[PDB]
Amino acid sequence: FVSEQSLNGRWTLKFFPQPAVPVMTIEGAEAANGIVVDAVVPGNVEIDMEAAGLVEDPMVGNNIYKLRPYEGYQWYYSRTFAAPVVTEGQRLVLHFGGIDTFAEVYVNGIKVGSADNMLIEHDYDITSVVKEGENRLDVIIRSSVMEAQNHFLGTLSIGNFSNEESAPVRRAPSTYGWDIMPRLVSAGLWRDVTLRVENPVTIVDANWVTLSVNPKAREASESLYLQTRLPFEMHDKVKAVITISRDGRQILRKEALMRKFANLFTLNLSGVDAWWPRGYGEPALYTAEVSLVDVTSGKIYDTKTSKIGFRTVKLELDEVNLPGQPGQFQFIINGEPVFAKGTNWVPLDALHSRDASHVEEAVQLMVEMNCNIVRCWGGNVYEDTHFFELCDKYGIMVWQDFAMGCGNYSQRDNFAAALEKEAISVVVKLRNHPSLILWSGNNDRVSRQVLSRVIYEFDPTRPYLPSSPGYYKDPFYTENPSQFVSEIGYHGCPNRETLERMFNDEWQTGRNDLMTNQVRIIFGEVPADLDDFIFASQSVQAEAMKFFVELWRGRRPYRTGIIWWNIRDGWPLLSDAISDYWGGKKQAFYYMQNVHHDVCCLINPAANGYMLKVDNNTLKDFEGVVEVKDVASGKQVFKGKFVSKANQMSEIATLPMQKGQGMLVISYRIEGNEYFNHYLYGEPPYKLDQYRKWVKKCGIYE
Amino acid sequence: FVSEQSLNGRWTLKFFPQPAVPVMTIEGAEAANGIVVDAVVPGNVEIDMEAAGLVEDPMVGNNIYKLRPYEGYQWYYSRTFAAPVVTEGQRLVLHFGGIDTFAEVYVNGIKVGSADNMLIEHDYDITSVVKEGENRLDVIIRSSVMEAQNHFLGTLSIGNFSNEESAPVRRAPSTYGWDIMPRLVSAGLWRDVTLRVENPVTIVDANWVTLSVNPKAREASESLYLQTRLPFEMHDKVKAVITISRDGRQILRKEALMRKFANLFTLNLSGVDAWWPRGYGEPALYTAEVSLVDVTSGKIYDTKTSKIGFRTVKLELDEVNLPGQPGQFQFIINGEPVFAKGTNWVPLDALHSRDASHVEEAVQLMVEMNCNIVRCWGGNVYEDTHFFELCDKYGIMVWQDFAMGCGNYSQRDNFAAALEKEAISVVVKLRNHPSLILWSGNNDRVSRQVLSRVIYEFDPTRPYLPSSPGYYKDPFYTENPSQFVSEIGYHGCPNRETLERMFNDEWQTGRNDLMTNQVRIIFGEVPADLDDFIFASQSVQAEAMKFFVELWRGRRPYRTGIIWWNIRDGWPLLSDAISDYWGGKKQAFYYMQNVHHDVCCLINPAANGYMLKVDNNTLKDFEGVVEVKDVASGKQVFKGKFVSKANQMSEIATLPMQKGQGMLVISYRIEGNEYFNHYLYGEPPYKLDQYRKWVKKCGIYE
DSSP states (O other), rough: EEEEOOOEEEEEEEEEOSSSSSSOOOHHOOOOOOEEEEEEESOOHHHHHHHSSSOOOTTTTTTTGGGGGGGGGEEEEEEEEEEEOTTTTTTTEESSSESSSSSEEETEEEEEEEEOSSSSSSEOOTTOOOOEEEEEEEEEEEOOOHHHHSSSOOOOSSSSOGGGGGGOOOSSSGGGGBTTBBBOOOEEEOOEEEEEEESSSSSEEEEEEEEEEEETTEEEEEEEEEEEEGGGGTTEEEEEEEEEEEEEEEEEEEEEEOOSSSSEEEEEESSSOOOOOOTSBBBBOEEEEEEETTTTOOEEEEEEEEEOOOOOOOEEEEEETTOOOTOOOEETTEEEOOEEEEEEOOOOSSSGGGGGHHHHHHHHHHHHTOOOOEETTTTOOOHHHHHHHHHHTTTOOEEEESOOOOOOOOOOOHHHHHHHHHEEEEEEEETTTTTEEEEOOOOOOIIIIIHHHHHHHHOTTTTTOOOOOOOSSSSHTTTTTOOOOEEEEOOOOOHHHHOOOOOHHHOOOOHHHHHHHHHHHHHSSSSSSSHHHHHHHHHHHHHHHHHHHHHHHHHHTTTEEEHHHHHHHHHHOOOSSBTTTTTTTTTHHHHHHHTTTSSSEEEEOOSSSSEEEEEOSSOOOOEEEEEEHHHHHHHHEEEEHHHHHHHHEEEEEEEOSSSSSSEEEEEEEEEEEEEEEEEEEEEEOOHHHHHHHHHHHSSSOO | EEEEEEEOOEEEEEEEEEOSSOOOOOOHHHOOOOOOEEESOOOOOOHHHTTTSSSSOTTTTTTTGGGGGGEEEEEEEEEEEEEOOTTTEEEEEESSOOOSSEEEEEEEEEEEEEEEEESSOOOOOOTTTSSOOOOOOEEOOOOHHHHHHGGGOOGGHHHHHHHEEEEEGSSGGGGGGBBBBBOOOOEEEOOOOOEEESSSSEEEEEEEEEEEEEEETTTTEEEEEEEEEEEGGTTEEEEEEEEEEETTTTEEEEEEEOOEEEEEEEEEEEEEOOBTTSSOBBBOOOEEEEEEEETOOOEEEEEEEEEOOOEEEEEOOSSEEEEEETEEEEEETTTEEOOOEEEEEOOSSSSGHHHHHHHHHHHHHHEEEEEEEOETTTTSSSOHHHHHHHHHTTTTTEEOOOSSSSSSOOSHHHHHHHHHHHHHHHHHHHOOOTTHHHHHHHTIIIIIIIHHHHHHHHOTTSSEEEEOOOOTHHHHHHHHOOOOEEEEOOOOOOOHHHHHHHHHHHHHHHOHHHHHHHHHHHSHHHHHHHHHHHHHHHHHHHHHHHHHHHHHHTTTTTOEEEEESSOOSSSSSSSSSBOOOSSSSOOHHHHHTTTSEEEEEEEEOSSSEEEEEEEEEESSSSEEEEEETTTTTOOOEEEEEEEEEETTTEEEEHHHOOOOOOEEEEEEETTEEEEEEEEESSSOOHHHHHHHHHHHHHOOOO
């Protein structure tokens, strides 16, 4: 964009209870009896009120329930802005990255738009209403909860675990409450507000599509679907300048005279690397830039730049074993069947204006874990562009769920038009990121028509799948027929430092019972000491998660992927996450890390023994040695060389059954690098002090 | 509702020919040159004009054809009403139970609505337009026939037996003419007009769904889908009070704090009886009441009460014998396959404001007949709530056809939006009646999309079936393959008292020939005497109907149901009904009554004799004796005991073929109760005097 003048910073926020007739004008907003405080954009209204000392910190104890009255409040944002320089023919666009949710937008007392979706951007042409000098921007938000009473719900929209208030509105269903995730509806301008100046000649969209890729020949066929705004007097007088580069070095430069507003450019490239997920290769990214330049004067009218990756994606459905069942598929990246291992992406923060501050660390948790895939939960908002940029950079594939609740939705025209608008917005915005590999829904009007037609018309290169949503050794897990398990979870108690900071009735804020259960089956009794209960509850979560991934990794090539719930909490809570809201890595995080390795030696239970395997999630063969040794006595159970064939599971040896309870060490070395693992044999209940000494003498985990 | 002030009574009706430009304003209505007369609401405009002596009685002779000019007239209803007490926050709703059809509704000279469907209710919020003191209500109806010329018809909408004027409008197709049913379009406010006052806290809908039922254990799982209007200041401060009772005794009382506007309550009940159709058990009904009560003050904001029945319905489709053919299904009520026997429901009156006055007696005709099912014809209007209440009370299942004509309809957006609005209105209004068991239609845009999507979203507990629409011993009836015959009919001449009251050209008002035919095949010659022709024509209809039901009852379990056309006339006419418009029971009515018994001994023709059967449409076993005796000579053909197994047909004996013509008596006694039947053997033509003596000496029918 020619000019991007930010409107972030200090605004004026006036809040008041919403009357029977909602306030939708500036006159009623300034006449209403309310409280005026300073606000920060981007932000949440609860953050502004806590800065004013009007609400307590909702992250401690039961303070979150004290935000209940504000769900029926209205929120009046207002600020003054200076009008940027607009010459004749240019357009001034007021850009909202996120309005939660129902609001009337005014510029100089003139309504410029009416917003009704918190998950998509909002752009309003304010060229004709802006004035010279000081201008006025007013946004009057009304109660999201009360808007639901403007709709009549179908039978199948009531009673589902999704809140009925979430059914007729386009908002993140998690904000209304889920499992233990607490109700925090909130409101406000939770993303950037900016002013954009566009030339009469401008780029509307630049769609990059990888037609084909030959990784060995270092070649790729890349298409550019360029749509521009082009006055006819500029036809045959503007040229498009396409530039592909990597690390400063220019790979390709193509110029073409713009004779029409929409064009397709096919670039056959040489000496370019393919984009691969983690383990299967390098996440090669190339800077793709297109510019509209005047042929005579050289004036640059617009320029769009993004980092793309040459990659092809295909979902291979298995119709021989369980045809059409959830999980009977496998991702084919660059013609190679990949094994998916990763986490489900939950909200990063109940106050979603703080999501961007957590994106960096949260994605890094997947890097240390070595996740090659991540499934963004449909109950959460759509993450912004920077999240996908990090997944592009670190080679983490993205499975994107369209925002839906666990329960049926409307089948009428009004809700379909709102979902089509949302789908077209999200698809066009994200369809150029190589990390994104799959759209997912869940004649049901939303998934089997509206979302499918949008993908068919705006993203034909990605698959669209409308489906797939006590003792960890129970047949419930060990005899699951799903080639690709999606949401597998287990509860763990957060670290003591997180407990003493977030905090009976406070712990409840049968799920808390589930914690005490799992410790009894594994360790016999519930430890009276708090520190002993934390280590025991975290060790149960650690072994259970490790067992799940090792099971799927060891049953390849039938098993094709495993996504687990989850990697990080979005609120200081007692849940199934392996890392809490403040960055505390629980005991499970380290157990899984030694199993998500590119080449991992593991043990699976066998009929008359233990099966020592080695899994390879790369495209190269590896040689090494592996040594199995009982922890307690130190006896060597197995030691020998192994060949890890590329992109497959390899069986090494069948170990004899050990006596009673105990632990085995897995010491294997690859190319001079030492890697470590373990296997808990025997039958529960175990002695907690014995399991503690096994971990300590193993010398792997603290 | 807090206040229901009726607006029924005397109105002011001004009628005039509709100009080229239809009158749609109060100013043009009062300026038009017309006639002003007193009117009665609810009513039909023809009834008001006959009270003024302006039209003759359209029930005598050819007077109905003199109402032709009024089809192009406009009708201007007008009255004054006092405004009920409305406090701050309350809503005043003007309720129309039925506007026929196209009208502009004005309150104090301000248009509050525009109506375009005579089959559904119309509600308009007149809170902002009502004034203190005397108010004005004006309804300007225009010509329904002329509105059709505002549409272009498809090829398949022209030429069908449905009138082309009925295709593009939402009106009862019967009003335009059907078979001999005469054309009487009519107009007016044919149902109640009332004023309703709603609190800010009010009940929008209370959907009762029987999830499951265990008749033996006297248990049932009942769900309540409650949708309310709830100001946020009332959240957590209003409670819902649910009460299930029967005959004053309270069965269940549940209270729940209203924390959101829409909720699902599941009630697991004990000591409750299931609802059964006639014969299969008791029509147990329970008073289900929900109220919104202020937790502090105890103020009752709203209360909705209705009688429900714990019942489950399933349509078992036969895909082995004739897969997908009409009639190859059977109703499963409470897990039991039921045998359906009943009548088709035609209009109760061509002037439909008189329907409510006939509902009581008409439903009683099905009670004396012992019908356990009734199919409301799609050419008729949707009956009101009281009709379904009587079917709930007397255990008569209801098969509801969506209002459609025999012929294809439009496939464009305008007609689909009008039908979706009508379907959503009718379904939400009737989905709580236990007697209702089936919705029926007939990629055809109406049945295979619009109606189906409405049922899927607003009534998932009931089946939706888009289909099934000379000598009575001709193979045309005796070799019909339909397990469930739906519209089986036969003509009979009404009683003499009905002829001398309704009345060549008058009798015509080849169908009248059909009467003279059927008497010739059965009795040889056409009786010259009128009384002799009436008895002969009614006896033909009586034996033919009796034969049809006995055929289906005797071929169970393959045959699953039989609905016959029809039980009652809606106008003094010569038709196939077994009871005329003035309540006169024709000879067929009594023949069918002795065959619709819960346990009926009957005879079916066999290959080399007669098959003596006993049918059981209950869930209990019965023992008795049966005696067969020839009428003319008095010889005993058969006598012995029989065991009637529950809910099945049982063969008793194969009787030898009797000589020549004659009649058999069927004298069977069950639990000390005497029941009677007969069988006409031989081959037509018969002597009418001989058949008369057979009936007289049989001692069953007068």
